[PDB]
């Protein structure tokens, strides 16, 4: 993984969703 | 991913950090996702930069965008109307300072006769040493592009020049020989002290127009203690 | 009920908002359910207006009315020595502006020597274009009510005035014609910076005494961030 | 649907209609889903417009957009070295002229006096009452946007001109009285001869390098018979 750290308070917008073409991003956490 | 955002990292909401309204639009490609300096106008309503109040807090517009980086603007928190959280006392993370558009250091190191600039990387033909500031700023808008004589301004008129450009889709760069040009960046600095603008802007420098909103501690994060603007 | 009156509507009580004691009886009639600019005495004392401090914050002293709309005096929170909080941050709701007394604008319309107030329903006696701070005063006092030439203040020129007066109950009016009489009122804004002031009275004009108490956003809310006096 | 795309109707494919490959890569915003008066280069290969060999056919490149009328360009007919298919002896149903770029008519209407034209709503300032194709040419360029020099081809004599712009954003129109100016719109016309142009352009113009290509019957449907350009 990248050296890059988001902090602060998840808000929406901050939201991991499946891809209006299709991707569930949900599922690649593991990868 | 290649990016971080700005966020509140502490808001508490029942110490003075408030709720309103826009009285305004939120432009998510120039001003989401960023520290803005707000005010409130004749009405209830809040708005980037200095209102009727002065600067009276700090505010980040925190909308998505896509895999593809476009932002959907559908969004319920970014139109005049919608209801947003406005901060003087708390904690930003991921902290940048707010600019709108850009700015260029211009030194001049020809001795006599003519250099040129090139303005979008096309050249700006000659410009001689020790021009004044308003022949300087004719010789870039003067340029054969969409740029006219309001999407700039023009200062520093020993041969340290300075370029300030509203639009953040003009880069101004060296060309002839006996001329230098640095654009002027703007990063967040550790153990550093931020102003607020009637702009809107948000960065380490007060002016005639700053008023204090915070300090850093580490460059990444923002102590926000906003002395609210007063007449 | 007839009537609003205010009340902090977020209050948190750690973050700088503080007990005390007051130093002082508070004037239900004229200082209850009202929102006062305090400081502290040269003791550990609240106090309206400015103490030995300056002004520290806002202080709102809460008292019920009866059934038939009168406050009773044996509270626990308004005379010298109950406790008391006082709020430097926090949000006001119901917010309007507080004075304290009556003033009234009085401007002679005729240019004839010979006009008549009435106070508090009788007539004042023969008026014309009056000295304010003499002629008009005296006219004012000199009727067999009980009120005397320390009830009222009067200033301005000969064609227009103002009666201020400390007492609630002591009521100017014209009678005669060729004069006009207004009672001054205030009323909050939205989006307005609004002042604390040595008398311990808030309104959105900064004197040459105005510690800046916060802002309202809607004109029914005050945003409450105090700046502190200092020496 | 609001559209209809050119097509090929009959193509046989055994009779002189052939297979190529693209030498250069497809425009799909300038040149997909239109009728392409084609050549060959030094190589074996299709290019628009006249190549070595001079126009030897008509191409369309038939190509999908999505639900937004974006086409992707991933596609496996589009590229340099992908195959395609060239006619000389068929029929294209929905037929449409091919152009680049725009054309304006220009006509004076004044007695004297200079006149004014703009460029996507941007004022030349003056052009003479008596000007030269050159110096009308040198007044629409210098308008302060990003069109050049070479954006432009001017002819004509005084009392009218003809505008010809190889890219499609720019507009031209008459500012005010005294001048007038018309968009030259193509259209399908019944009963005409078509031609091919060096440039990969077809219409109902031979000019100095038309190569005929095929005639209109009802508009719609063009009915190709390529008389091959030759030495």
Do not use: C
């Not at chain 2, 505010?59 to 896509?66: E, R, S």
């Not at chain 2, 959280?85 to 003519?114: L, W, Y």
């Not at chain 2, 308003?134 to 008129?157: Q, W």
Request: net charge negative; charged share 20%.
């Amino acid at each position: 993984t990248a050296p890059v750290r988001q902090e602060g308070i998840m808000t929406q917008g901050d939201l991991v969703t499946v891809t209006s073409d299709g991707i569930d991003l949900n599922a690649l956490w593991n990868s | 991913a290649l990016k971080t955002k700005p966020r509140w990292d502490k808001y508490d909401g029942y110490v003075g950090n408030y709720r309103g309204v826009l009285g305004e639009d939120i432009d998510l490609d120039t001003e989401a996702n960023r520290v803005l300096a707000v005010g409130t106008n004749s009405n209830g309503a809040i708005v980037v930069g200095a209102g009727q109040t002065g600067i009276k807090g700090l505010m980040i517009v925190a909308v998505g965008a896509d895999i593809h980086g476009a932002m959907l603007d559908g969004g319920i928190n970014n139109h005049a109307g919608d209801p947003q959280d406005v901060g003087k006392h708390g904690e930003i993370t991921n902290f940048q300072p707010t600019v709108f558009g850009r700015t260029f250091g211009v030194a001049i190191s020809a001795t006599e006769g003519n250099v040129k600039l090139a303005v979008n990387g096309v050249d700006t033909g000659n410009i001689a040493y020790d021009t004044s500031a308003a022949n300087l700023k004719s010789g870039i808008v003067a340029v054969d592009d969409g740029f006219t004589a309001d999407d700039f301004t023009v200062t520093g008129t020993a041969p340290n020049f300075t370029i300030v450009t509203t639009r953040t889709d003009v880069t101004i760069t060296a060309s002839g020989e006996g001329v230098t040009v640095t654009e002027a960046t703007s990063v967040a600095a550790a153990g550093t002290n931020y102003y607020g603008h009637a702009d809107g802007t948000v960065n380490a420098v007060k002016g005639s127009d700053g008023v204090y909103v915070g300090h850093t501690q580490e460059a990444d994060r923002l102590i926000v203690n906003v002395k609210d603007e007063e007449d």
